[PDB]
């Protein structure tokens, strides 16, 4: 007796190193990567609903900058928001800035509702030449500047706009800094002005604030801009002594908040991937990536580590 | 391994089978043959097929987040979600690096384990008929042609046809 059967295995000649409880370096003979290192140079238009701010940012979108009229109705998934954004309009500042542009952001929609404010015998729609629109002297087309009277009249303001609708309201509205006490009368009347806007639940008020500033855009002026959310069956009043930069009317909130915000230069393609990092879209099936951590989507999860082997056979044992 | 046939008694694997995990390397009096075992090849598969399975799909839907690039410091609120960002990505790290050893520990018995049942079963159809050798392979008391080999390996080898004649083998 003397015929002979055996046992054994496969195996190739050079496997992959993979890492065990034990081990750093084990060698198998299949092995899959479970970090994707690899990005798309481009954003993926679908299936996300892509807007692209193009030369605005998100917020001189909303105050209806000069570039942003294409922004108008604009519905997002991932509203895209370029680094090489310029401002076109009159200098400003949003004292709670990324609070606002987050609101907008998540909000996920420029659906603008006009209003008509009978304003009292102030002049209405007052322009600039640091905010010009095809060459012509304009402003932020969602506000409205408001000055005194030919004959010097700029009397106290009290108008109420009542919310019975079905929705949220936004109301953007802002506030003049002129740099000269001179520059307030010839403006405004009164010195010094103020603004109270209120609701049924709060109340703000701002003191306009006069000094020299720097030049921006060939001006020492400055608007500063905040922003009021009515609920259904709340209301809002606006009081005025001078200064106000006033809302033309106000903007949709969703009920259900879901959309957000990519900051990039990348351009956006004709792939398809529901994955979107700064650096650009993702196209995988793995679980993790160190591509980058801002990432927005149905995305891997960000981990430091730039590779992790998942064992997919055998230990390796060659000839 | 747990086991200790894959780089255990087994001392290498093959590279001339290559249409199955596992498999059958015989000698008898007409020659020499390598041929792949389906059952123990499919359940290695399946099992670390699963595994894939389970793995990718995950399901992170995130949309708004938080800011985690910054040009300035501007104190305790950005540090706080530099902080928070900080901290969720090392525990995911963590959770990554973990995941895949675990994994890759189980993988490997797993097969190891394949190996074991594979030679077990081979030792249980062989009865009194053959003596394990120790490196995965059996000798085998009696003579066996051809048919005789693939009967051990589809399953249908019938140990009291040449018991008598292997009995007689290995003890004079
Ligand atoms: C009167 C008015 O409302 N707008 C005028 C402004 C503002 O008074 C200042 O910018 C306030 O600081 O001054 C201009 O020279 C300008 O910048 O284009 C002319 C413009 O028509
Ligand atoms: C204007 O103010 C008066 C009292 O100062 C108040 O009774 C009235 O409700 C206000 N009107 C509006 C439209 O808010
Ligand atoms: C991601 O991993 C690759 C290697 O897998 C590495 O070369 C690259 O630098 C990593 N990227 C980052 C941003 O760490």
Redesign the interface.
């Known amino acids: 007796?003397?015929?002979?059967?055996?046992?054994?295995?496969?195996?190739?000649?050079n496997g992959t190193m993979?890492?065990?409880?034990?081990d750093d370096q084990?060698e198998?003979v299949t092995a899959?990567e479970?970090?994707e290192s690899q990005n798309l140079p481009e954003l993926c238009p679908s299936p996300l609903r892509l807007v692209d701010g193009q030369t605005c940012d998100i917020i001189n979108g909303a105050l209806g900058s000069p570039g942003c009229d294409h922004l108008n109705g604009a519905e997002w998934?991932?509203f895209i928001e370029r680094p090489n954004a310029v401002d076109t309009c009159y200098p400003f500042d949003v004292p709670e800035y990324?609070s606002l542009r987050?609101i907008l952001?998540?909000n996920g929609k420029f659906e603008f509702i006009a209003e008509e404010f009978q304003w009292n015998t102030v002049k209405q729609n007052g322009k600039s030449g640091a905010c010009k629109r095809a060459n012509v002297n304009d402003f932020f087309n969602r506000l409205n500047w408001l000055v005194k009277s030919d004959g010097n009249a700029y009397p106290l303001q009290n108008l109420t706009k009542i919310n019975n609708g079905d929705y949220a309201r936004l109301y953007i509205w802002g506030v003049h800094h002129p740099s000269t006490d001179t520059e307030q009368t010839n403006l405004y009347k009164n010195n010094p002005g103020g603004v109270t806007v209120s609701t049924k639940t709060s109340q703000t008020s701002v003191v306009p604030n006069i000094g020299s500033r720097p030049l921006v855009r060939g001006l020492s002026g400055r608007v500063s801009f905040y922003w009021t959310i009515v609920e259904p069956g709340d209301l809002i009043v606006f009081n005025t002594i001078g200064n106000l930069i006033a809302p033309r009317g106000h903007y949709k909130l969703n009920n259900q908040?879901?959309?957000?915000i990519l900051?990039t230069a990348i351009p956006i393609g004709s792939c398809v991937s529901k994955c979107h990092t700064?650096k650009g879209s993702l196209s995988t099936?793995?679980?993790?990536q160190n591509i980058s951590?801002?990432?927005?989507?149905?995305?891997?999860?960000?981990?430091?580590?730039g590779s992790?082997?998942?064992?997919?056979?055998?230990?390796?044992?060659?000839? | 391994?747990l086991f200790g046939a894959?780089?255990g008694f087994?001392?290498?694997?093959?590279?001339g089978?290559?249409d199955?995990?596992?498999?059958?390397?015989?000698?008898?009096?007409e020659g020499t043959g390598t041929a792949a075992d389906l059952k123990s090849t499919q359940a290695?598969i399946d099992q670390?097929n699963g595994?894939?399975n389970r793995?990718?799909?995950?399901?992170?839907?995130?949309?708004?987040?938080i800011?985690?690039?910054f040009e300035q410091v501007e104190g305790r609120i950005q540090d706080l979600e530099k902080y928070v960002?900080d901290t969720k990505?090392?525990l995911?790290?963590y959770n990554?690096?973990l995941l895949?050893?675990?994994?890759?520990?189980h993988?490997?018995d797993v097969?190891?384990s394949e190996?074991n049942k594979?030679?077990e079963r081979?030792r249980r159809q062989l009865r009194e008929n053959?003596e394990d050798?120790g490196?995965?392979?059996?000798?085998?008391?009696?003579?066996?042609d051809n048919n005789c080999?693939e009967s051990?390996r589809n399953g249908t080898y019938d140990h009291d046809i040449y018991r008598d004649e292997?009995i007689n083998?290995?003890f004079q």
């Open positions: 007796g003397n015929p002979v059967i055996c046992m054994g295995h496969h195996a190739v000649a993979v890492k065990t409880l034990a084990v198998v899959q479970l970090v998934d991932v990324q987050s952001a998540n908040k879901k959309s957000t900051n700064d099936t793995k679980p993790f951590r801002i990432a927005v989507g149905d995305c891997p999860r960000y981990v430091k580590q992790l082997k998942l064992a997919t056979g055998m230990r390796n044992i060659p000839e | 391994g894959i780089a087994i001392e290498n694997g093959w590279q089978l290559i199955g995990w596992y498999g059958f390397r015989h000698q008898n009096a290695a670390i595994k894939l793995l990718i799909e995950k399901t992170n839907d995130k949309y708004h987040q800011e985690k690039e960002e990505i090392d995911w790290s990554a690096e895949v050893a675990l994994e890759n520990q993988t490997i097969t190891d190996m594979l030679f081979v053959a050798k490196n995965g392979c059996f000798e085998i008391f009696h003579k066996c080999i051990i292997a083998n290995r």
